[PDB]
């Protein structure tokens with residue numbers, strides 16, 4: 127089946143990515159899919175369904191779903207926006223009830239979807255060329271609330287039950303490294319790899335989507351929720367008509383929509399199922415998987431250099447057979463630092479006590495360039511804040527991002543003002559003064575005392591700074607001492623940031639003891655819609 131069918135009415139809009147590049151993206155994402163399912167696929171699927179049986183999901187109220195709407199979610203064509211929804215206005219609510227009643231009445235009529243080009247910031251790099259704008263398909267604000275009513279409890283309960291430890295989103299960055307490192311140590315002869323699927327969303331066949339539904343149907347579901355899942359599957363999930371920003375009929379989808387509630391959850395389940403089955407086809411001994419949507423890391427017992435090269439080809443053959451071919455073929459790695467997943471890679475450093483600590487790190491180029499864009503054109507989303515949270519132990523986040531933004535915030539007297547940030551699915555509102563507490567909860571106390579980084583990691587940061595015209599780490603060290611000083615003078619929460627966050631900047635280091643606030647770390651108390 128053709129992933130996409132196009133009419134000719136072009137993708138109209140509302141370095142960066144424009145709608146002018148969309149034509150190239152369309153070509154990459156449009157293709158025929160050929161699925162050849164085998165007995166392993168069926169066996170894994172029965173195992174998964176059995177684990178889903180145990181889940182019981184609650185149907186959310188019309189009002190309950192409104193308070194989970196992100197404040198920046200696109201407005202409805204029916205005259206009401208995200209604000210109107212979370213304020214529980216009669217226009218929003220009465221219209222949402224009609225959408226809900228329509229899902230329970232209509233079982234065939236496809237739900238209309240909007241095709242858009244994602245405006246992302248990438249780096250102006252003269253190996254490879256400019257990437258074309260990613261495509262984003264989504265239903266109306268109204269349908270998006272009903273999706274949450276019928277499936278919010280499912281998606282935020284089910285994957286963890288079906289996949290257990292293989293489910294990526296359950297982990298904090300510290301917990302993810304803990305998992306990866308333990309699984310690598312657990313093997314007597316470790317050999318891992320990361321499998322990148324070319325255009326994941328486009329490889330998701332109508333059967334794949336119906337297979338996910340078959341899994342959601344294994345929970346205890348309210349009759350209404352059960353019907354709504356059935357209707358949302360056939361009217362939205364399995365495909366539908368596309369409509370550009372203007373209002374013209376753009377084309378027809380027969381794959382995954384990125385702007386749906388099930389996207390993340392479903393992708394994880396689909397990728398897990400395919401990979402898990404392909405592990406049996408390739409006869410990969412003592413397997414460990416870590417699935418983060420379309421992202422997949424496999425750790426196992428090596429069976430020899432030649433044998434592993436062969437087993438990896440068998441894995442790929444099997445994945446391709448399940449309509450999930452690779453971008454570039456996976457190579458077996460015998461060092462965990464070389465395996466790249468969720469754009470990041472495990473690195474090592476030493477804390478105060480001299481103990482070797484593992485941490486996740488990525489190439490600073492994109493985070494830095496994105497932050498430099500944020501600095502210029504004003505945005506409601508702060509990639510830098512996310513990056514400071516997610517990559518807190520890294521040399522780059524600590525020395526550049528933290529130094530830069532804290533000096534900016536100190537100067538604007540905005541340290542006490544909350545900021546909206548998106549970490550993968552979830553949207554949070556965090557005050558920078560609260561960061562130490564969060565960083566400790568997500569990474570550990572070692573996050574503030576790290577030193578003795580890998581020479582290569584140090585050079586990756588160094589060379590990257592030169593390339594972007596960013597002042598050297600020596601400049602940053604100096605700048606940090608001034609921020610640290612100005613923070614400690616302020617006292618209270620401001621002084622905690624100075625003490626913990628900026629300890630690396632001083633010659634005369636302080637004894638960093640566990641934070642009095644992070645002792646009773648709640649989390650999800652910063653949570654403002656998702657997931």
Ligand SMILES: O=C(NC1CC1)c1ccc(N2CCN(S(=O)(=O)c3ccc(OC(F)(F)F)cc3)[C@@H](C(=O)NCc3ccc(OC(F)(F)F)cc3)C2)nn1
Nearest residue numbers: 281295297298299390391468470486516550551552652657
């Ligand atoms: O799509 C989702 N669900 C659909 C399928 C059903 C979904 C999406 C996100 C999500 N979460 C909760 C767990 N965490 S979390 O880290 O505990 C955290 C908690 C609070 C916080 O904000 C604060 F603290 F400020 F409140 C900030 C972080 C975040 C995360 O994305 N984790 C994965 C991950 C972890 C490490 C990685 O590695 C590297 F670091 F390299 F990226 C890469 C991915 C956010 N949960 N579910």
Ligand SMILES: O=C(O)/C=C/c1ccc(NC(=O)C2(NC(=O)c3ccc4c(C5CCCCC5)c5n(c4c3)CC(=O)Nc3ccccc3-5)CCCC2)cc1
Nearest residue numbers: 494495496497498499501526527530594595596597598601
């Ligand atoms: O050799 C020595 O001993 C010292 C050398 C030295 C060299 C250059 C400076 N530069 C500066 O002071 C100024 N810019 C900066 O001090 C600066 C700060 C952050 C910058 C960033 C990012 C850093 C991460 C958060 C967002 C801002 C970028 N660029 C930056 C420049 C360079 C830039 O202009 N743009 C980009 C573009 C892409 C990526 C990064 C950048 C301030 C006004 C005049 C220029 C300072 C010291």
